[PDB]
Design a binder for this molecule. Structure first.
Ligand SMILES: *C(=O)CCCCCCCCCCCCCCC
Lengths: 186, 432, 140, 207
């Protein structure tokens, strides 16, 4: 029909409401701040609860992304990477992640977050400098979305600019393409 | 009045502009001082009036001290100025600073006049009043007239340390301590009532500078000046020199003493202190109290973990009440807050080599002849032991026991040891 | 047009931070100037903005070769007071606007650091360190 | 200036009651992420659990979500004061001006619509009336079980109360003299019938 470029600009410019990114950042910052507050600063597995957060969010966001875009079910890692990089983030967060670090035989790749609106302004405490991720919700949302698109992936964070690394990378390695179900009529 | 203010922004903006633009002129201060004193000539009859006059004359004296410092080089206390290469000749008023003696008196007169004018501004302006007063105090300190300086600073003894003005506090406290120290007697002084002792005020100021100053290791001068120079029992809000955390919880240490290990970070003092006695208090929910304390401890410089022993214990739950250290002369206290719900328990630790008393219902008895049995595990050699037993009232106004058929007795204190003894009992009415 | 000291004070006259952008007794002098300055916000000598809903800037006073400027944030009670030297100013409107630009830059720094959603509730030891890091990053 | 999609924001802002309820479970569906088996639980399950848990845990989660909203409002305050630049003062005894600011700008920035008319006691309290209340405009259970709907949807009314409390904080009055309560007592006067039947009312007390 049309290129994913044209689709992303068309959907973003004239088919979605808008708000200030500062306020979204503020809300997510409040969530993470209070999770730190009410949990004795157990950064080892506040990330797990944030992962559950992100999974529950993404599993029900996918119904809206497909509602607007109306793409077919992705089958191969190349098309999944292209769609995630090019329109899936462009609709919601208005960013274009870059893709590098292709693994062997096209089973894994990495999302590079050039600009992260979830962390427009944060300076973590000293104890968090090598424990917390602060953006686990994003990869949780990605996994939850791909679950309903019916392809399982282990997704995790390799690096983050917040902790001190040069760039923020999210490995999204596929595990298996689980198949559609059939009635169990004997 | 509306004219007066607008005149003042007019003159302030004009003097600002002419000062910034008329630079490099050797006659700048010569022009400016006479300009200020002429411009001042129009306000002579309100709070705003006094404020404006005081501000203008403050500008006058500041330019005056700039000129005399530049032309003479004699430092007024320590206020340094930008050392401009070009020379300025403020010489036509070479009468008030021909000597360094009358110079200080003249500056003091100007400062006192300015203080009076500001103080006559109702009560909407206290800050510059206080700063100017301590400037008079520093002038007295420079002039070596410490008797007036200490009296003046007694008012603002400790104002700038709870307001988070740490550098101001550091100057005022160090100069106060130095002034108090040098002159011989200074044996009686009063702040706002009864005369507080010289030793008490001195050690208060010393401890304040120790807790306030933070220079890694160069506070050793103040440490030595404290422990070479100069008592009354004194308490203090400990927080500032020591911090305390409850490492782990209670465990056995010796035969018949509970023990709790705790670490405390000490950085108020630079060197080590031989504390004669330390005591941690654990209040009980009912109201009881106990103490954990290990005496004659040399507190290490920095972070150190020590075990506190206890002797009298009431098994159950406790909430921590107050921690304390007793140094020779002073008793630091830190009272923990209340309603924490962070209770620490003191369980019934049992050891073979430990003395205890066991009480129970008697094993063998006759019908309707109630009794009790007391034992003593490891009675062995014991210099002395006394055991007191009593009953608690339950209707909250009953006492279901008498240790007699005549009187309602509820106690019988032994005075001798025993390996096994049969206490008697008589029920009152029906209690199970 | 560097500043000699920068002072941030909150609503309750609790001095948040009196940074000096590096003599051993200089922080003393700048603190005295700041404490003297803090009074004029509650003073009838000079009328504050009270018009157009915009922070309005004025030159409040000047002592011992330090030109000190100030802002009262009406809607929060935040108070900014920073100093400058005699020997690094010309006094024309372009510099008067450049110093203003520095003022909004400082207030951006304070907003960002106080806006960090990891400050626990009130930790001054953390706020001071973060503000000091940002000010070192800028003035260097 | 940069923007983010209102849909993802609205959904995220909706979904803290499951967060505020499951954090309690962790304090007091198994699957593997990479090597260690984490547990995840749905959102509607936790909404029902909050609906029928017990009174003290319900109150704990209510105060929990109030704290969240307090942080959000207090923290967005400074941004709004910078950007819009209203004509307020630090402790203005004229509560009408503060309430006008909150009605005009805070809600315009959080939700898409200005809040509707407001009462004026002129002595004590104030009322803020919202019609159709964007975040929960698409909530429902059943054709008949409308009684359970309003009792189950209660905790979602806290985050704007927290927003109001936080905005009042850092603007003078602290969180010891001010108290606010949300409710459905507002009735649709004449507005067109939207999906949700009842508008909401925020009763704000300020001495
Ligand atoms: C085949 O059609 C694959 C489609 C790709 C899945 C769509 C991913 C949607 C989620 C993107 C991230 C949303 C933002 C989450 C942060 C709050």
């Amino acid at each position: 029909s049309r290129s994913l470029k044209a689709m992303g600009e068309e959907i973003w410019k004239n088919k979605t409401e808008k708000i200030n990114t500062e306020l979204f950042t503020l809300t997510y910052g409040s969530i993470v701040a209070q999770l730190c507050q009410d949990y004795e600063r157990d950064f080892n597995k506040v990330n797990d609860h944030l992962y559950s957060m992100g999974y529950n969010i993404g599993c029900r966001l996918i119904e809206d992304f497909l509602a607007r875009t109306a793409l077919p079910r992705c089958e191969n890692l190349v098309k999944t990477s292209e769609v995630l990089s090019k329109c899936a983030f462009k609709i919601f967060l208005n960013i274009t992640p870059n893709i590098t670090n292709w693994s062997h035989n096209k089973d894994t790749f990495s999302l590079i977050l050039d600009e992260n609106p979830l962390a427009d302004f944060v300076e973590l405490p000293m104890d968090a400098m090598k424990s917390l991720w602060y953006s686990n919700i994003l990869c949780g949302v990605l996994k939850g979305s791909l679950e309903m698109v019916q392809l399982d992936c282990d997704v995790w964070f390799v690096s983050d600019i917040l902790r001190g690394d040069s760039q923020t990378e999210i490995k999204v390695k596929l595990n298996r393409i689980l198949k559609d179900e059939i009635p169990i009529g004997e | 009045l509306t004219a007066f203010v607008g005149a003042f922004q007019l003159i302030k903006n004009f003097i600002e502009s002419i000062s910034i633009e008329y630079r490099k002129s050797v006659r700048l201060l010569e022009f400016k001082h006479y300009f200020i004193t002429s411009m001042l000539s129009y306000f002579e009859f309100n709070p705003l009036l006094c404020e404006i006059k005081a501000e203008l004359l403050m500008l006058k004296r500041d330019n005056w001290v700039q000129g005399v410092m530049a032309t003479s080089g004699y430092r007024l206390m320590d206020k340094n100025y930008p050392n401009s290469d070009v020379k300025y000749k403020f010489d036509l008023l070479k009468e008030t600073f021909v000597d360094e003696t009358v110079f200080q008196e003249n500056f003091l007169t100007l400062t006192k006049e300015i203080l009076s004018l500001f103080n006559k501004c109702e009560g909407k302006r206290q800050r510059i009043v206080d700063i100017l007063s301590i400037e008079i105090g520093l002038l007295y300190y420079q002039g070596k007239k410490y008797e007036e300086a200490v009296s003046l600073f007694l008012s603002c003894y400790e104002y700038y340390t709870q307001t988070n003005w740490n550098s101001i506090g550091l100057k005022i406290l160090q100069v106060f301590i130095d002034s108090l120290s040098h002159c011989p007697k200074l044996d009686v002084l009063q702040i706002d009532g009864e005369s507080v002792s010289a030793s008490a005020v001195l050690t208060n100021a010393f401890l304040n500078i120790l807790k306030l100053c933070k220079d890694n290791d160069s506070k050793e001068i103040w440490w030595k000046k404290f422990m070479d120079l100069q008592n009354i029992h004194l308490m203090y809000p400990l927080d500032g020199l020591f911090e305390v955390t409850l490492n782990s919880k209670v465990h056995l240490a010796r035969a018949n003493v509970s023990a709790i290990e705790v670490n405390l970070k000490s950085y108020g003092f630079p060197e080590d202190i031989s504390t004669k006695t330390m005591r941690l208090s654990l209040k009980n929910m009912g109201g009881d109290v106990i103490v954990f304390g290990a005496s004659d401890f040399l507190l290490k410089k920095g972070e150190n973990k020590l075990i506190l022993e206890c002797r009298d214990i009431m098994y159950g739950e406790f909430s921590l009440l107050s921690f304390e250290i007793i140094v020779e002369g002073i008793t630091f206290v830190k009272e923990f807050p209340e309603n924490q719900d962070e209770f620490i328990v003191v369980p019934e630790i049992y050891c073979k080599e430990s003395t205890k008393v066991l009480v129970k219902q008697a094993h063998n008895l006759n019908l309707g002849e109630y009794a009790l049995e007391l034992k003593s595990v490891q009675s062995d050699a014991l210099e002395s032991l006394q055991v007191e037993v009593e009953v608690q009232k339950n209707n909250m106004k009953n006492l279901p026991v008498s240790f007699s058929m005549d009187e309602i007795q509820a106690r019988k204190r032994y005075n001798t040891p025993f390996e096994n003894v049969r206490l008697e009992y008589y029920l009152l009415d029906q209690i199970t | 047009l560097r500043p000699c000291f920068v002072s941030l004070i909150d609503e309750s006259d609790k001095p948040i931070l009196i940074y000096v952008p590096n003599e051993m007794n200089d922080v003393l002098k700048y603190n005295v100037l700041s404490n003297i300055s803090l009074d004029y916000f509650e003073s009838a000598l000079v009328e504050w903005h009270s018009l157009d809903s915009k922070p309005l800037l004025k030159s409040i006073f000047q002592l011992e070769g330090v030109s000190v400027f100030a802002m009262l944030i009406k809607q929060t009670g935040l108070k900014i007071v920073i100093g400058f030297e005699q020997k690094s100013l010309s006094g024309a409107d372009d510099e008067f606007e450049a110093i203003n630009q520095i003022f909004e830059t400082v207030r951006k720094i304070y907003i960002r650091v106080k806006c960090n959603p990891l400050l626990v509730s009130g930790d001054e030891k953390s706020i001071i360190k973060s503000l000091e890091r940002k000010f070192d990053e800028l003035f260097i | 200036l940069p923007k983010v999609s209102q849909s993802v924001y609205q959904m995220l802002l909706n979904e803290m009651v499951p967060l505020a309820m499951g954090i309690e479970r962790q304090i007091s569906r198994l699957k593997i992420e990479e090597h260690h088996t984490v547990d995840i639980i749905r959102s509607h399950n936790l909404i029902h659990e909050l609906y029928k848990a017990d009174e003290e845990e319900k109150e704990k989660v209510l105060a929990r979500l109030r704290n969240i909203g307090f942080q959000i409002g207090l923290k967005l305050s400074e941004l709004l004061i910078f950007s819009n630049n209203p004509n307020l003062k630090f402790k203005e005894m004229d509560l009408l001006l503060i309430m006008k600011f909150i009605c005009r700008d805070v809600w315009k920035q959080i939700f898409g619509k200005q809040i509707d008319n407001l009462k004026t006691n002129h002595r004590g309290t104030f009322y803020l009336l919202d019609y159709d209340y964007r975040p929960i405009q698409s909530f429902s259970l059943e054709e008949d079980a409308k009684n359970e709907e309003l009792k189950m949807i209660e905790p979602f009314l806290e985050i704007p109360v927290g927003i109001i409390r936080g905005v009042l904080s850092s603007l003078g009055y602290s969180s010891e003299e001010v108290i606010c309560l949300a409710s459905f007592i507002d009735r649709p006067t004449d507005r067109p019938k939207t999906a949700f039947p009842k508008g909401v009312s925020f009763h704000v007390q300020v001495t």
